[PDB]
Amino acid sequence: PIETVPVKLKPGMDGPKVKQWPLTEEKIKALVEICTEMEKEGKISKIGPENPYNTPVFAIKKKDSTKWRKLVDFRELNKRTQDFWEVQLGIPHPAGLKKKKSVTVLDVGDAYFSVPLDEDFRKYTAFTIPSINNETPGIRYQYNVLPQGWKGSPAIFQSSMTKILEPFKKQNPDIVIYQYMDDLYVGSDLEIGQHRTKIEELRQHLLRWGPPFLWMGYELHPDKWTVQPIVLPEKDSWTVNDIQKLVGKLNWASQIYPGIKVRQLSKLLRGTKALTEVIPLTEEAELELAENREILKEPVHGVYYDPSKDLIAEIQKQGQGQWTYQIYQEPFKNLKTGKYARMRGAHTNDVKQLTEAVQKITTESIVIWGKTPKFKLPIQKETWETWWTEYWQATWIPEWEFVNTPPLVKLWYQ
Amino acid sequence: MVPISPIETVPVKLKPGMDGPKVKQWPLTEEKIKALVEICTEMEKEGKISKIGPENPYNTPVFAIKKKDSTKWRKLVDFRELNKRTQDFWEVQLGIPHPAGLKKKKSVTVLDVGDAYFSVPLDEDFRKYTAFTIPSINNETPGIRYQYNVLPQGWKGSPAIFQSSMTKILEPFAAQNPDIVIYQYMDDLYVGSDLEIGQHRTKIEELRQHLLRWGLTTPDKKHQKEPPFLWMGYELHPDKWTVQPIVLPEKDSWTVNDIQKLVGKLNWASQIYPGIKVRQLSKLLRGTKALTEVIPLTEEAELELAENREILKEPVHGVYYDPSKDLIAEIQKQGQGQWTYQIYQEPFKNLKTGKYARMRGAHTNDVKQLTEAVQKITTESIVIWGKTPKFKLPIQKETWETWWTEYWQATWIPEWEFVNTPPLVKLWYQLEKEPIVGAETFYVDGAANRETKLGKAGYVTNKGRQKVVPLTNTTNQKTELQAIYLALQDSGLEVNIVTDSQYALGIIQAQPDKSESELVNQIIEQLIKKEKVYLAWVPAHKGIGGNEQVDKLVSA
Numbered sequence A: 001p002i003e004t005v006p007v008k009l010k011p012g013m014d015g016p017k018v019k020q021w022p023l024t025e026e027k028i029k030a031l032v033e034i035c036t037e038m039e040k041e042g043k044i045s046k047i048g049p050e051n052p053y054n055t056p057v058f059a060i061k062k063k064d065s066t067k068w069r070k071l072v073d074f075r076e077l078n079k080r081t082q083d084f085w086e087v088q089l090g091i092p093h094p095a096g097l098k099k100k101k102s103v104t105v106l107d108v109g110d111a112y113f114s115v116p117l118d119e120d121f122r123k124y125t126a127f128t129i130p131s132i133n134n135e136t137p138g139i140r141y142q143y144n145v146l147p148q149g150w151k152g153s154p155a156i157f158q159s160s161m162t163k164i165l166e167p168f169k170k171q172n173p174d175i176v177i178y179q180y181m182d183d184l185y186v187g188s189d190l191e192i193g194q195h196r197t198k199i200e201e202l203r204q205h206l207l208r209w210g211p212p213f214l215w216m217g218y219e220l221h222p223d224k225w226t227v228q229p230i231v232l233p234e235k236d237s238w239t240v241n242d243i244q245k246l247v248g249k250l251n252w253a254s255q256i257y258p259g260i261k262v263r264q265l266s267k268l269l270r271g272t273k274a275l276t277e278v279i280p281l282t283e284e285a286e287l288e289l290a291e292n293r294e295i296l297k298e299p300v301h302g303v304y305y306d307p308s309k310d311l312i313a314e315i316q317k318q319g320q321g322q323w324t325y326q327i328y329q330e331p332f333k334n335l336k337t338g339k340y341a342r343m344r345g346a347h348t349n350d351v352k353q354l355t356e357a358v359q360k361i362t363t364e365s366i367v368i369w370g371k372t373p374k375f376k377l378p379i380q381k382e383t384w385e386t387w388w389t390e391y392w393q394a395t396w397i398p399e400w401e402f403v404n405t406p407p408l409v410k411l412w413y414q
Numbered sequence B: 001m002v003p004i005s006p007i008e009t010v011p012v013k014l015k016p017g018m019d020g021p022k023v024k025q026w027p028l029t030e031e032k033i034k035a036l037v038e039i040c041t042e043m044e045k046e047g048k049i050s051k052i053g054p055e056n057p058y059n060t061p062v063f064a065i066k067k068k069d070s071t072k073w074r075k076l077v078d079f080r081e082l083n084k085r086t087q088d089f090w091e092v093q094l095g096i097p098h099p100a101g102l103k104k105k106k107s108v109t110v111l112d113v114g115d116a117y118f119s120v121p122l123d124e125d126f127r128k129y130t131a132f133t134i135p136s137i138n139n140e141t142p143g144i145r146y147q148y149n150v151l152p153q154g155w156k157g158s159p160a161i162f163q164s165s166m167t168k169i170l171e172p173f174a175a176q177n178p179d180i181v182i183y184q185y186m187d188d189l190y191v192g193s194d195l196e197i198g199q200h201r202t203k204i205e206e207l208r209q210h211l212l213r214w215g216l217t218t219p220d221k222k223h224q225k226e227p228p229f230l231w232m233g234y235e236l237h238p239d240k241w242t243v244q245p246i247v248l249p250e251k252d253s254w255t256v257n258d259i260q261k262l263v264g265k266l267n268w269a270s271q272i273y274p275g276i277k278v279r280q281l282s283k284l285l286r287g288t289k290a291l292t293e294v295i296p297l298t299e300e301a302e303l304e305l306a307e308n309r310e311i312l313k314e315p316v317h318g319v320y321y322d323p324s325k326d327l328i329a330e331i332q333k334q335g336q337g338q339w340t341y342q343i344y345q346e347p348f349k350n351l352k353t354g355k356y357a358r359m360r361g362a363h364t365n366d367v368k369q370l371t372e373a374v375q376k377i378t379t380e381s382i383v384i385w386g387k388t389p390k391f392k393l394p395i396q397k398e399t400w401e402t403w404w405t406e407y408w409q410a411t412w413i414p415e416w417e418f419v420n421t422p423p424l425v426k427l428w429y430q431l432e433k434e435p436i437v438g439a440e441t442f443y444v445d446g447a448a449n450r451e452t453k454l455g456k457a458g459y460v461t462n463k464g465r466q467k468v469v470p471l472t473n474t475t476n477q478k479t480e481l482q483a484i485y486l487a488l489q490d491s492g493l494e495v496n497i498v499t500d501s502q503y504a505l506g507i508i509q510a511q512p513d514k515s516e517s518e519l520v521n522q523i524i525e526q527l528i529k530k531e532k533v534y535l536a537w538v539p540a541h542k543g544i545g546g547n548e549q550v551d552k553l554v555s556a
C-alpha cells in the first residue's frame, strides 16, 4: 500500500474537539506502552500545538484476553467524516447472516495498519494520552495509517479485503462473510466441530496475506436467538389484582395490535372489590381473553426496517440479573424484542450487567441490520459515564441517551 | 563560537478564508515616537524584530505607556485583531495539578526561562502578519516598519508554542533522569528530587548544560522567594499545603458581587476546609444579573455564613500523596441537599476535602445524592491520583442492598464500607410488590375543570368508605395526587391503593424522600407512617369499577 485515498470532512464541519476524560494509572501506562510501539512501527507520530483537534482514547481488555487494547472513541469524528462510497455505494447487508447456524466474529482491525492515511486528514485523528494530576503535558499523537474504529477505515480497505476473501469465498460458496468496522462476521451452517478450523482457515490466510488479537473468535448462534412475543397469564383463579394488571397489559398492547378488546374483562371489575378477591371469569370474558391471546400470536402488521432511519433500543432492568430490550425505529413497531439473564461477572453490579447487555444488543443489531442502535439507558448519566468504560470489551461504541422517568412498560414485558 | 541546535519551528496558519490584520496606526506624540524608536532599535539588534519594506500590506497598532515609579517608556503591540484571525492551538496548560496529588520532594529548585522565551523562532511564513509601524517625527518621512522574528507577547499562539517547545527540549533530560521531576508554568521551571542537596544541583547543572545545547540562558530565579510558593492560589510548604489566606469580609449590606466573590472564596476554601456550606448563600444569586443590587441575607444564610467563619477561624492544612498507602474517602450528609467529604490515607490527615450540592429538581432522595457524590469523588480522584478511593459511607449495607436491588434504574458504587456517622442515609418507605391481604382497598381519582380551575378528589373502598373533597385553584395532576393523599390519611397501617394516574405513578415510583411540592411532601410523610402500601395502576375510562365509580364522583 503506497498511494493514499483522498478523504475530506462533511461540508461546513471542522475536526473533532472532544475532551479527553480521566484515565486510571494502569490504563495510562498501558496506552503509553502501546503507543510507544505504534510510534516505532510508524503507525502514529507526535504532533505539535498547531493541531487543535482531539478524540478521546482509553484502554480495554477484550473478552477472554489478558492484554490491554487501545480503543479510540471516534464517534465524533465518524459523524463528521464524509459519507463513504469507496468503490461503490454500499454492499447490501447480508440478510442471511442472521439465519446461519453459527457466526464467528474476528478482530481484523490490525489489517488497517498496513494502509497509509491521507496526509491532509491525519490531523483530525489527533488524540491525547493524559497524565495523572496534569503534572506533565499530555502525549499528543496523530495517525499515519487507517485507525481502528474510524468509519473510513473499512471503506478504504474494502478494496483490499475483497481480494483476501475471494480465495476462500469461491472455495466455500455457502459461508457468509460480513464486515463491520474492525470486526469480521463469518457465518456457516456446518457443525461446530470443524467450524473452528474453518475459522482458522480464515486466520492464517490473513497471516499469509499479511496481529495481537486475531487468534480469538467471538462465537454466536443467531438461529437460536430468542424473540419474545407478548404473553398473557394462564390461571385457574383470577384475583381483582390479576384482572386489573391484565386489562392494563392488554390496553397497552392495543396500541400495537388491532382488535385487542378488554370490554368483557372490565365488566368483571364491576364494583369496589378488594384486590385479593378471586373473581370467576364469565364465558364472554374467557372468550375475549382467548381472542386477545391469539391476536398476540401473530406478528405486528406493517413493520419494516427503514435503512434511512436510526435504530432505537430501549432497555428495562427487571431485577435478579434479568434485562428486557426492544429494538424499533418508530414507537410500538418493534423490529426485535429479547430478554437476557445471568450476566457472568456481575451478580452484584448493575452497571456491568447493563454494559454487557448494551454490547450484546449492539452485536445482534449489527448481525441483523448492519448498524448500531441508539440506546435509551435506564441509568443516570453521571453513573453510566463514570463506569461504562471499565466493562467495555467491544471495538465499536454506539450512541446512547438516558431515561430519568420510570416507564410503565416494564411491568408488561416482565 | 559553540554551535547550538535550532529550536524546531511550529507551522502557524490563519483561520481558513481570513486574511491578516490591516489596522491603522494611531497618531503618537513626539516623545512616544522617540521612545519607541529606542526600544525597537535594541530589539532589532537582539533579533526579536526586523525592518521590512513597504510591500507588506498588514499592520498592527503600537502604543507607548509608562509605569508608576519606573520613569521608563514601554511598548505595546495591540495584537487583538491578529489574534481573532489566528488559528486555534492546543492549549497544553488547561488543567493545573492539585497539591493533594503531589509527592514530597526533598529539594526543589526554580529556574527562570524568560530569556529562553525569545530563542523560540516564529514561523517565517507567518511573520508578515505581525507587521507594525512606528509613525515618524511630524509625519515627514516614511514610518519605520518592523515584523516579529520571535513569539510576540500578547499573540494568541505564544503560550502554546513556547510551552510545547520547552517540553520537546526537556523530554530527553526527564526521561533519562527519572529520579527528578520537572514542572513548567509561565517563565518558571520547577525541578524537584529526593536526592540529597549536594547531588540535587549536579542534576541542575546538567540541566543547564542540556538547555545550553539549544543556547538557552537559564540562571537561578532572581530573588529566590522562600517557602511557601505562591502558585495558583496555594501555599506549597515543604511538608504540607494549604490555600492562600482566606479572609471573609465583614459587612452589613451584601450585594450581588459580594456574595459572588463570597461563594468563590468558600468554593476555593472547601478543598481543605471541611464542612463548608454554600447552599443558602448561593441560592440568593439565582436570578440576578446586576452585580450592584443589594439583597437582604436570609437568617439561614447568615447562620451558614457564621458557620463558615468558625470553620475558617484557624488555617487548615493538607498532606501530600503517598502511593504506598491506601486512598480513603469519607462522606457526611449536611442537610438541604449538601454533602461534604474528606480524602485521606491515614486518619486525621486529609489529603483534601470537598463538597457536593444536589442538582435542581422537583423530587429527590438521599440515596441518589449520595450516589452522585460518590461519582464526583470517583472522577475527581482519577484526575488527582489515577485511582478510585475506598469509600466510607453513612449508609448501612442492608439499606444499599435493598435500594439497588429494587430500584428501577441501574446503579453502582465502588468498594465501600458503612461508617456510623449520623445522620445516616436510609430508605424512608418501601412499596409492596403484591396486594396486601386483609388491607382495605382504596380506589382513588381526581379531576379538575381546566377553565375555572375547580376540581374534586377522593376515593371509594371495598368496605364502603367514601370521600370526595371539592377543590379550588387546582389541576388534574394536582387532584390526582390529592386523591392518593386522602387515601393514605384515612386508611390504617396497611392499605391497597388503586389509581389511574400515570403522573402520580411516575413520581412515586421514583422513590423521593423530599420534594419542592408541598403536596408530594405530605404524601411522603404519610408513606413513612405506614406499614405496608401497595400502589396499583389501571387504565382510566376502561370500565374498571371502583375506579369508574370514583371517576364519576369527581367529574362533577
Ligand SMILES: COc1cc2nc(NC3CCN(Cc4ccc(C(N)=O)cc4)CC3)nc(Oc3c(C)cc(C#N)cc3C)c2cc1OC
Pocket: A135, A136, B097, B102, B103, B104, B105, B106, B107, B108, B109, B181, B182, B183, B190, B191, B192, B227, B229, B231, B236, B237, B238, B239, B320
Ligand atoms: C511524578 O511527577 C511529578 C511529581 C511532582 N511532585 C511535586 N511535588 C512537590 C510537593 C511539595 N512541594 C512543596 C515544597 C517541598 C519542598 C521544598 C524544599 N525545597 O524544601 C519546597 C517546596 C514541592 C513539589 N511537584 C511537582 O511539580 C511542581 C508543581 C506541580 C508545582 C510547583 C510549584 N510552585 C513545584 C513543583 C516541583 C511534580 C511534578 C511531576 O511531574 C512533572
Ligand SMILES: [Mg+2]
Pocket: B445, B446, B447, B500, B540, B551
Ligand atoms: Mg379520571
